[PDB]
Coordinates of C-alpha atoms and ligand atoms in Angstrom, one line a residue:
Chain A
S1 CA 88.5 80.8 116.2
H2 CA 89.5 80.6 112.5
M3 CA 90.0 84.4 112.4
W4 CA 91.1 86.8 115.1
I5 CA 90.6 90.5 114.5
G6 CA 92.1 93.2 116.7
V7 CA 90.5 96.6 116.6
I8 CA 91.9 100.0 117.7
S9 CA 89.0 102.4 118.2
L10 CA 87.7 105.3 120.3
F11 CA 84.3 103.7 120.0
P12 CA 84.5 99.9 120.8
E13 CA 80.8 99.7 121.3
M14 CA 80.1 100.4 117.6
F15 CA 81.3 96.9 116.8
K16 CA 78.3 95.4 118.6
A17 CA 76.7 96.1 115.2
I18 CA 78.4 93.0 113.8
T19 CA 79.3 91.0 116.9
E20 CA 75.7 91.0 118.2
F21 CA 73.5 90.6 115.1
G22 CA 73.0 88.3 112.1
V23 CA 75.4 85.8 110.6
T24 CA 78.4 87.7 111.8
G25 CA 76.9 87.9 115.3
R26 CA 76.4 84.1 115.2
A27 CA 79.9 83.6 114.0
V28 CA 81.3 85.5 116.9
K29 CA 79.2 83.7 119.5
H30 CA 80.3 80.4 118.0
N31 CA 83.9 81.4 118.2
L32 CA 84.4 81.2 114.4
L33 CA 85.3 85.0 114.5
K34 CA 86.9 86.8 117.4
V35 CA 86.8 90.6 117.6
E36 CA 88.9 92.2 120.4
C37 CA 89.1 96.0 120.9
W38 CA 91.5 98.4 122.4
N39 CA 90.5 102.0 123.1
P40 CA 93.2 104.7 122.8
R41 CA 91.4 106.6 125.6
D42 CA 92.4 103.8 128.0
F43 CA 96.0 104.7 127.3
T44 CA 95.9 108.4 128.1
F45 CA 97.4 109.8 131.3
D46 CA 96.1 113.3 131.6
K47 CA 93.1 114.1 133.8
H48 CA 90.8 114.6 130.8
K49 CA 91.9 111.5 128.8
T50 CA 92.7 113.6 125.7
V51 CA 92.8 111.6 122.5
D52 CA 93.2 114.3 119.8
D53 CA 95.9 116.8 119.0
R54 CA 96.7 119.8 116.8
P55 CA 98.1 119.2 113.3
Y56 CA 101.4 120.8 112.6
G57 CA 101.1 123.6 110.0
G58 CA 97.7 124.6 111.3
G59 CA 94.6 124.2 109.3
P60 CA 91.1 123.2 110.7
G61 CA 90.4 119.9 112.3
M62 CA 92.4 117.7 114.7
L63 CA 94.3 114.4 114.5
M64 CA 94.4 111.4 116.7
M65 CA 96.9 112.0 119.5
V66 CA 100.1 109.9 118.8
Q67 CA 101.0 108.5 122.2
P68 CA 97.6 107.0 123.2
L69 CA 97.0 105.6 119.7
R70 CA 100.6 104.3 119.4
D71 CA 100.3 102.5 122.8
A72 CA 97.0 101.0 121.9
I73 CA 98.5 99.6 118.7
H74 CA 101.5 98.2 120.6
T75 CA 99.2 96.4 123.1
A76 CA 97.1 94.9 120.3
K77 CA 100.3 93.7 118.5
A78 CA 101.4 92.1 121.8
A79 CA 98.1 90.4 122.2
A80 CA 98.1 89.3 118.6
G81 CA 101.5 87.7 118.6
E82 CA 103.5 87.2 115.4
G83 CA 101.9 87.1 112.0
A84 CA 99.2 89.7 112.4
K85 CA 98.8 92.1 109.5
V86 CA 98.2 95.7 110.7
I87 CA 95.7 97.6 108.5
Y88 CA 94.7 101.3 108.7
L89 CA 91.3 102.1 107.2
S90 CA 91.7 105.1 105.0
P91 CA 90.4 106.6 101.8
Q92 CA 94.0 106.9 100.6
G93 CA 94.4 103.1 100.8
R94 CA 93.8 100.3 98.3
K95 CA 90.2 100.3 97.3
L96 CA 88.4 97.3 98.6
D97 CA 86.8 94.9 96.2
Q98 CA 85.8 91.2 96.2
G99 CA 89.3 90.2 95.1
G100 CA 90.8 92.2 97.9
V101 CA 88.3 90.6 100.3
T102 CA 89.4 87.1 99.4
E103 CA 93.0 88.2 99.7
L104 CA 92.5 89.6 103.2
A105 CA 90.5 86.5 104.2
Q106 CA 93.7 84.5 103.9
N107 CA 95.0 86.1 107.1
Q108 CA 94.3 84.4 110.4
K109 CA 95.1 87.5 112.4
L110 CA 94.3 91.1 111.6
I111 CA 94.6 94.4 113.5
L112 CA 92.4 97.2 112.2
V113 CA 93.3 100.8 113.1
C114 CA 90.2 103.1 113.1
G115 CA 90.9 106.8 112.9
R116 CA 88.7 109.7 113.8
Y117 CA 89.0 113.5 113.3
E118 CA 91.2 114.2 110.3
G119 CA 93.2 111.0 110.6
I120 CA 96.5 110.0 112.1
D121 CA 100.1 111.0 112.0
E122 CA 101.8 109.9 108.8
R123 CA 104.8 108.6 110.7
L124 CA 102.6 106.1 112.5
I125 CA 101.5 104.8 109.2
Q126 CA 105.1 104.3 108.2
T127 CA 106.2 102.7 111.5
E128 CA 103.1 100.7 112.6
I129 CA 100.9 100.1 109.6
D130 CA 101.4 97.3 107.1
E131 CA 98.6 98.2 104.7
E132 CA 96.1 101.0 104.1
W133 CA 92.6 100.0 102.8
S134 CA 89.6 102.0 101.7
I135 CA 86.1 100.8 101.4
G136 CA 85.3 103.3 98.7
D137 CA 85.9 106.7 97.1
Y138 CA 84.0 108.7 99.7
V139 CA 84.7 110.2 103.1
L140 CA 83.3 108.9 106.4
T141 CA 83.6 110.4 109.9
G142 CA 85.5 107.4 111.2
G143 CA 87.3 104.2 110.4
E144 CA 84.8 102.0 112.4
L145 CA 82.2 101.5 109.7
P146 CA 85.0 100.8 107.2
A147 CA 86.5 98.3 109.6
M148 CA 83.2 96.6 110.2
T149 CA 82.6 96.5 106.5
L150 CA 86.0 94.8 106.0
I151 CA 85.3 92.3 108.8
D152 CA 81.8 91.5 107.6
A153 CA 83.1 90.9 104.0
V154 CA 85.9 88.6 105.0
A155 CA 83.8 86.7 107.6
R156 CA 81.7 85.4 104.8
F157 CA 84.7 83.4 103.6
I158 CA 85.3 81.8 107.0
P159 CA 84.1 78.2 106.8
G160 CA 80.9 77.7 108.7
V161 CA 79.9 81.4 108.9
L162 CA 77.4 81.1 106.0
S163 CA 77.6 87.9 93.8
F164 CA 80.8 88.7 92.0
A165 CA 81.7 85.0 92.4
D166 CA 82.3 85.0 88.6
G167 CA 82.9 88.8 88.6
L168 CA 79.3 89.3 87.6
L169 CA 76.3 91.0 89.2
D170 CA 73.8 88.6 90.7
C171 CA 70.6 87.7 88.8
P172 CA 67.1 88.9 90.0
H173 CA 65.5 86.9 92.8
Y174 CA 61.8 86.0 93.4
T175 CA 59.8 84.5 96.2
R176 CA 56.1 84.3 97.2
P177 CA 53.6 85.4 96.0
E178 CA 53.4 84.2 92.4
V179 CA 51.8 87.6 91.4
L180 CA 52.8 90.9 93.1
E181 CA 51.0 94.1 92.1
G182 CA 50.1 92.5 88.7
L183 CA 53.8 91.4 88.2
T184 CA 54.3 87.6 87.8
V185 CA 57.4 85.5 88.5
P186 CA 59.2 84.5 85.3
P187 CA 57.5 81.3 84.2
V188 CA 60.9 79.4 83.8
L189 CA 61.6 79.8 87.6
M190 CA 58.4 77.8 88.4
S191 CA 59.0 75.1 85.7
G192 CA 61.2 72.9 87.9
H193 CA 63.7 72.7 85.0
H194 CA 66.9 72.8 86.9
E195 CA 69.1 73.2 83.8
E196 CA 67.0 75.9 82.2
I197 CA 66.8 77.7 85.6
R198 CA 70.6 77.6 85.8
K199 CA 71.0 79.1 82.3
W200 CA 68.4 81.8 83.0
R201 CA 70.3 82.9 86.1
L202 CA 73.7 83.0 84.4
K203 CA 72.2 84.8 81.4
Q204 CA 70.5 87.4 83.6
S205 CA 73.7 88.0 85.5
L206 CA 75.6 88.6 82.2
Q207 CA 72.8 90.8 80.9
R208 CA 72.6 92.9 84.1
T209 CA 76.4 93.2 84.2
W210 CA 76.5 94.3 80.6
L211 CA 73.7 96.9 81.0
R212 CA 74.7 98.3 84.4
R213 CA 78.5 97.7 84.8
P214 CA 79.9 97.1 81.3
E215 CA 83.4 97.8 82.6
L216 CA 83.3 94.7 84.8
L217 CA 83.0 92.5 81.7
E218 CA 86.1 93.9 80.0
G219 CA 88.4 92.4 82.7
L220 CA 86.7 89.1 82.4
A221 CA 87.6 86.0 80.4
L222 CA 84.2 84.4 79.5
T223 CA 83.6 80.7 79.2
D224 CA 82.0 79.5 75.9
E225 CA 78.7 79.2 77.7
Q226 CA 78.9 82.7 79.1
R227 CA 79.8 84.1 75.7
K228 CA 76.8 82.3 74.2
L229 CA 74.4 83.5 76.8
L230 CA 75.7 87.1 76.7
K231 CA 75.3 87.2 72.9
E232 CA 71.8 85.9 73.2
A233 CA 70.9 88.6 75.8
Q234 CA 72.4 91.3 73.6
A235 CA 70.5 89.9 70.5
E236 CA 67.3 89.9 72.5
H237 CA 68.1 93.4 73.7
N238 CA 68.6 94.5 70.1
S239 CA 65.3 93.1 69.0
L240 CA 63.4 95.4 71.4
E241 CA 62.4 99.0 71.7
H242 CA 64.1 100.9 74.5
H243 CA 63.4 104.0 76.6
Chain B
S1 CA 66.1 118.1 111.6
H2 CA 67.7 119.0 108.3
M3 CA 67.7 115.4 107.2
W4 CA 65.3 112.6 108.0
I5 CA 66.2 109.0 107.2
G6 CA 63.8 106.1 107.4
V7 CA 65.4 102.7 107.8
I8 CA 63.8 99.3 107.1
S9 CA 65.9 96.6 108.9
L10 CA 65.6 93.3 110.7
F11 CA 68.3 94.7 113.1
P12 CA 67.4 98.3 114.1
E13 CA 69.8 98.1 117.0
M14 CA 72.8 98.1 114.6
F15 CA 72.2 101.7 113.9
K16 CA 73.2 102.7 117.4
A17 CA 76.7 102.5 115.9
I18 CA 76.1 105.9 114.2
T19 CA 73.3 107.4 116.4
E20 CA 75.1 106.9 119.7
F21 CA 78.7 107.7 118.9
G22 CA 81.0 110.4 117.4
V23 CA 79.9 113.4 115.3
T24 CA 77.0 111.4 113.8
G25 CA 75.8 110.6 117.3
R26 CA 76.1 114.2 118.2
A27 CA 74.2 115.2 115.1
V28 CA 71.4 112.9 116.1
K29 CA 71.1 114.0 119.7
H30 CA 71.1 117.6 118.4
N31 CA 68.3 116.9 116.0
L32 CA 70.3 117.7 112.9
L33 CA 69.9 114.1 111.8
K34 CA 66.9 111.9 112.5
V35 CA 67.1 108.2 112.0
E36 CA 63.8 106.2 112.4
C37 CA 63.6 102.4 112.0
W38 CA 60.9 99.9 111.1
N39 CA 61.5 96.2 111.5
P40 CA 59.8 93.8 109.1
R41 CA 59.5 91.3 112.0
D42 CA 57.0 93.6 113.6
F43 CA 54.8 93.2 110.5
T44 CA 54.6 89.4 110.6
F45 CA 51.5 87.6 111.6
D46 CA 52.5 84.0 112.1
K47 CA 53.4 82.6 115.5
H48 CA 57.1 82.5 114.8
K49 CA 57.4 85.9 113.1
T50 CA 58.9 84.5 109.9
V51 CA 60.8 87.1 107.9
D52 CA 62.5 85.0 105.2
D53 CA 61.1 82.8 102.4
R54 CA 62.2 80.3 99.7
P55 CA 63.4 81.6 96.3
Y56 CA 61.4 80.4 93.3
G57 CA 63.5 78.2 91.1
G58 CA 65.3 76.7 94.1
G59 CA 69.0 77.2 94.8
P60 CA 70.6 77.7 98.2
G61 CA 69.8 80.6 100.4
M62 CA 66.6 82.4 101.3
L63 CA 65.1 85.8 100.5
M64 CA 63.4 88.5 102.6
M65 CA 59.7 87.5 102.9
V66 CA 57.7 89.9 100.7
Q67 CA 54.6 90.7 102.9
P68 CA 56.4 91.8 106.1
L69 CA 59.0 93.8 104.1
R70 CA 56.4 95.4 101.9
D71 CA 54.3 96.4 104.8
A72 CA 57.3 97.8 106.7
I73 CA 58.2 99.9 103.6
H74 CA 54.6 101.2 103.2
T75 CA 54.6 102.3 106.9
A76 CA 57.9 104.1 106.5
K77 CA 56.6 105.9 103.3
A78 CA 53.5 106.9 105.2
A79 CA 55.6 108.3 108.1
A80 CA 57.9 110.1 105.6
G81 CA 55.2 111.8 103.7
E82 CA 55.7 113.0 100.1
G83 CA 59.1 113.7 98.6
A84 CA 61.1 110.8 100.3
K85 CA 63.4 108.9 98.0
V86 CA 63.4 105.2 98.6
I87 CA 66.8 103.5 98.3
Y88 CA 67.7 99.8 98.3
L89 CA 71.3 99.0 99.4
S90 CA 72.6 96.5 96.9
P91 CA 75.9 95.5 95.1
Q92 CA 73.9 95.7 91.9
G93 CA 73.2 99.4 92.5
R94 CA 75.1 102.6 91.5
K95 CA 78.5 102.5 93.1
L96 CA 78.8 105.2 95.8
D97 CA 81.4 107.9 95.5
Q98 CA 81.8 111.4 96.8
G99 CA 79.9 112.8 93.9
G100 CA 77.0 110.4 94.6
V101 CA 77.2 111.3 98.3
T102 CA 76.8 115.1 97.6
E103 CA 73.9 114.2 95.3
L104 CA 72.2 112.1 98.0
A105 CA 72.8 114.9 100.5
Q106 CA 70.4 117.1 98.6
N107 CA 67.5 115.0 99.8
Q108 CA 65.7 116.1 103.0
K109 CA 64.1 112.7 103.3
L110 CA 65.4 109.2 102.6
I111 CA 64.1 105.7 103.2
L112 CA 66.8 103.1 103.2
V113 CA 65.8 99.4 102.7
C114 CA 68.3 97.0 104.2
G115 CA 68.2 93.4 102.9
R116 CA 69.4 90.2 104.5
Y117 CA 69.8 86.6 103.3
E118 CA 70.2 86.6 99.5
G119 CA 68.3 89.8 99.0
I120 CA 64.7 90.8 98.1
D121 CA 62.1 90.1 95.5
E122 CA 62.8 91.8 92.2
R123 CA 59.2 93.0 91.9
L124 CA 59.6 94.9 95.2
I125 CA 62.5 96.8 93.7
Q126 CA 60.4 97.7 90.7
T127 CA 57.3 98.7 92.6
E128 CA 58.8 100.3 95.8
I129 CA 62.4 101.3 95.2
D130 CA 63.4 104.5 93.5
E131 CA 67.2 103.9 93.4
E132 CA 69.6 101.1 94.1
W133 CA 73.0 102.0 95.6
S134 CA 76.2 100.0 96.4
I135 CA 79.0 101.1 98.7
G136 CA 81.5 99.0 96.8
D137 CA 82.2 96.0 94.6
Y138 CA 82.2 93.5 97.5
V139 CA 79.5 91.4 99.2
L140 CA 78.3 92.0 102.8
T141 CA 75.9 89.9 104.9
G142 CA 73.4 92.7 105.1
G143 CA 72.4 96.2 104.0
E144 CA 72.8 97.7 107.4
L145 CA 76.5 98.6 107.2
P146 CA 76.0 99.9 103.7
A147 CA 73.1 102.0 104.9
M148 CA 75.0 103.4 107.9
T149 CA 77.9 104.1 105.5
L150 CA 75.6 106.1 103.3
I151 CA 74.1 108.0 106.3
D152 CA 77.5 108.8 107.8
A153 CA 78.8 110.0 104.4
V154 CA 75.8 112.3 103.7
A155 CA 75.6 113.5 107.3
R156 CA 79.0 115.2 106.9
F157 CA 77.3 117.6 104.4
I158 CA 74.6 118.6 106.8
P159 CA 75.4 122.1 108.1
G160 CA 76.5 122.0 111.7
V161 CA 77.4 118.3 111.8
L162 CA 81.1 119.0 111.4
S163 CA 89.4 114.5 101.1
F164 CA 88.2 114.3 97.4
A165 CA 87.1 117.9 97.8
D166 CA 89.1 118.6 94.7
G167 CA 88.9 115.0 93.5
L168 CA 92.3 114.3 95.1
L169 CA 93.6 112.2 97.9
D170 CA 94.4 114.1 101.1
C171 CA 97.9 115.1 102.0
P172 CA 99.9 113.5 104.9
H173 CA 99.2 114.9 108.4
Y174 CA 101.4 115.3 111.4
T175 CA 101.0 116.1 115.1
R176 CA 103.2 115.9 118.2
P177 CA 105.9 114.9 118.8
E178 CA 108.4 116.7 116.5
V179 CA 110.4 113.5 116.2
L180 CA 108.8 110.0 116.2
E181 CA 111.0 106.9 116.0
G182 CA 113.7 109.0 114.4
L183 CA 111.3 110.5 111.9
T184 CA 110.9 114.2 111.9
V185 CA 108.0 116.4 110.8
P186 CA 108.6 118.1 107.4
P187 CA 110.4 121.4 108.3
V188 CA 108.0 123.5 106.2
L189 CA 105.0 122.5 108.4
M190 CA 106.7 124.0 111.4
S191 CA 107.9 127.2 109.6
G192 CA 104.7 129.1 110.1
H193 CA 104.6 130.1 106.4
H194 CA 100.9 129.8 105.7
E195 CA 101.3 130.2 101.9
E196 CA 104.2 127.6 101.7
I197 CA 102.2 125.2 103.9
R198 CA 99.2 125.6 101.6
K199 CA 101.3 124.8 98.5
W200 CA 103.0 121.8 100.2
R201 CA 99.6 120.3 101.0
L202 CA 98.2 120.8 97.5
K203 CA 101.4 119.4 96.0
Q204 CA 101.4 116.3 98.3
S205 CA 97.8 115.7 97.4
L206 CA 98.6 115.8 93.7
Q207 CA 101.7 113.6 94.2
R208 CA 99.9 111.0 96.3
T209 CA 96.9 110.9 93.8
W210 CA 99.3 110.6 90.9
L211 CA 101.3 107.7 92.5
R212 CA 98.4 105.8 94.1
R213 CA 95.3 106.6 92.0
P214 CA 96.5 107.9 88.7
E215 CA 93.0 107.2 87.2
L216 CA 91.5 109.9 89.5
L217 CA 93.6 112.5 87.8
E218 CA 92.4 111.7 84.3
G219 CA 88.8 112.8 85.0
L220 CA 90.1 116.0 86.5
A221 CA 90.5 119.5 85.0
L222 CA 93.5 121.0 86.9
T223 CA 94.0 124.6 87.7
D224 CA 97.2 126.3 86.5
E225 CA 98.5 126.0 90.0
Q226 CA 97.7 122.4 90.3
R227 CA 99.3 121.6 86.9
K228 CA 102.4 123.4 88.1
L229 CA 102.6 121.7 91.5
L230 CA 102.0 118.3 89.9
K231 CA 104.8 118.8 87.3
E232 CA 107.1 119.8 90.1
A233 CA 106.3 116.6 92.0
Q234 CA 106.8 114.5 88.9
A235 CA 110.1 116.3 88.2
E236 CA 111.2 115.7 91.8
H237 CA 110.1 112.1 91.5
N238 CA 112.1 111.7 88.3
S239 CA 115.3 113.0 89.9
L240 CA 115.3 110.2 92.5
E241 CA 116.1 106.6 92.8
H242 CA 113.1 104.3 93.3
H243 CA 112.4 100.8 94.8
Ligands
SAM301 C1 87.0 112.2 108.4 S1 88.2 110.9 108.0 C2 89.7 111.8 107.7 C3 89.8 112.2 106.2 C4 91.2 112.8 106.0 N1 91.0 113.9 105.0 C5 92.3 111.8 105.5 O1 93.3 112.3 105.0 O2 92.2 110.7 106.0 C6 88.3 110.1 109.6 C7 88.8 108.7 109.6 O3 87.9 107.8 108.9 C8 88.6 107.0 107.9 N2 87.8 106.9 106.7 C9 87.0 107.8 106.1 N3 86.6 107.5 104.9 C10 87.1 106.2 104.7 C11 87.1 105.2 103.7 N4 86.4 105.5 102.5 N5 87.6 104.0 103.8 C12 88.3 103.7 105.0 N6 88.5 104.6 106.0 C13 87.9 105.8 105.8 C14 89.9 107.8 107.7 O4 91.0 107.1 107.0 C15 90.2 108.6 109.0 O5 91.0 107.7 109.9
SAM302 C1 74.4 88.6 101.2 S1 73.8 90.1 100.4 C2 72.9 89.4 99.0 C3 73.7 89.2 97.8 C4 72.9 88.8 96.6 N1 73.8 87.8 95.8 C5 72.3 89.9 95.7 O1 71.9 89.6 94.6 O2 72.0 90.9 96.3 C6 72.6 90.5 101.6 C7 72.1 92.0 101.6 O3 73.2 92.9 101.8 C8 73.2 93.9 100.7 N2 74.6 94.2 100.4 C9 75.6 93.4 100.3 N3 76.7 93.9 99.7 C10 76.3 95.2 99.5 C11 77.0 96.3 99.0 N4 78.3 96.2 98.5 N5 76.4 97.6 98.9 C12 75.1 97.6 99.3 N6 74.3 96.6 99.8 C13 75.0 95.4 99.9 C14 72.4 93.3 99.6 O4 72.0 94.2 98.5 C15 71.4 92.3 100.2 O5 70.2 93.0 100.5

């Protein structure tokens, strides 16, 4: 495979969501993407396979038990070999974005640590984790969805598996029928004029980015064409009434 | 159930990731959360159950076929009844954050439309969708993970199901053993001093937010205690060497 991803999770079966369906599922079956899981519960030794533990200092909630998680991590690292970057999914980590995705996609091996409960021991992060990554400024019940989100995002960059390409939102899309609930497809898209169609899409993208996410434009160095199309959109916007 | 979520997806089985595991899985089994899916493929009429279609204007990629998707949406709305907010998961939508999560959690009924391929017809968004939401500035292969991310996030706010609570990153956590690879647990956490422990956690949160996500603090109105603890952390930071 072009990319191998080790996963530490109490719920390995959750990953079937990406390994068994759609383009990512195809990628896995075709060995372009390999996802291997290790479950901390399999590394417990007590009768009830305990995987959580009490946080020092008290407070509500529990934490992942260190020993089972630590052993699971070590086993994954042994299976990965040298060169594998170990990531902990966490809202305290670097916020994921397309730029970060392409950066992570450069790794041929990754080990993703998925926490549950209130998280994991800080010392494990310092001694076992290379990088902490967040998929957004919100809190989820576990690191599994965040891990799958990361895998799915990077997988798109793996040759053969298959917006923001120019740091812009995508343009609107249209398919059959020509008229839907009285709404028609923009005439230009049905003209067959490749060049005009190209410009329409770029202009729409610039317009939509300007109107919905103006901040995204600030950190962007526009080409002469982009500057022109944007100015046209803004001029057209300024010649209209608005709600 | 306290919250009912309708889902339109070509891959209903992906949702087992949240309905069959962990706290969200418990919430579903206990009827606190209800997730019902409709698959556009079930609404096709041609021999091969086609669910994609060509985008007008050409260009690579396909789009969700309108008729099957539209019919799936209508059926969900009929099953939901009045009051259900229809959301389309899309990177062009409002970027999800804890504030948005709590806002969405106020809805007792939600219908989540999950796209595949290059997306869906813009006219469907205008005629069937109430709001567009994104889980982050990155591109995924489908709206299923984003939808599950949204469901998981909101589910945490449903009474009985169970960071950023104060707009701050969480503080470090520790559990057994007392010493891990030569690293000890901060003495204060094992002192039993509830008040000192409380202050340590708040201070750590402020410190971590300041160091990792300084922007998060700007849009925050600190309490006198928070201002004090932050100043202490910064003073302590300024009295040390740094790498
Ligand atoms: C309920 S959360 C724990 C939140 C906790 N207050 C903290 O300090 O991490 C459970 C697990 O899901 C992960 N998680 C939750 N939200 C996440 C996000 N936005 N991105 C990545 N991982 C996330 C956590 O890092 C943690 O391992
Ligand atoms: C490959 S994406 C299509 C990207 C396309 N360029 C666009 O204009 O939407 C396939 C599906 O996943 C959804 N999706 C991808 N990234 C997402 C995100 N960050 N948040 C929410 N939905 C997302 C899309 O909205 C779309 O329905």
